[PDB]
């Protein structure tokens, strides 16, 4: 029951710098983008009804 390891895993996790990505739209534009992704086009679907963040 020692207190010596208190920031063990966070301390030893290899730091990875965040990428430089483009700014996202905000407000009405972001909602329009969501509406276009979800209801207007069916591009990414394979007919199998997967999720938006499916990696398989």
């Amino acid at each position: 029951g020692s207190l010596a390891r208190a920031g063990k895993v966070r301390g030893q996790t290899p730091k990875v710098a965040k990428q430089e990505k483009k700014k996202k739209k905000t407000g009405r534009a972001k909602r329009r983008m969501q509406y276009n992704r979800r209801f207007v086009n069916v591009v990414p679907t394979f007919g199998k009804k997967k999720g938006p963040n499916a990696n398989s």
Partner: peptide, 30 residues
């Protein structure tokens, strides 16, 4: 990856909720 039998041999394991959710997503996708 197939939800149908994933649910048939994972519903007792740690992954019951995920495979159940995927199987229901296949069945009624909207």
């Amino acid at each position: 990856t197939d939800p149908f039998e994933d649910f048939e041999f994972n519903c007792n394991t740690k992954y019951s909720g995920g495979v159940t959710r995927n199987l229901m997503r296949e069945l009624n996708g909207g």
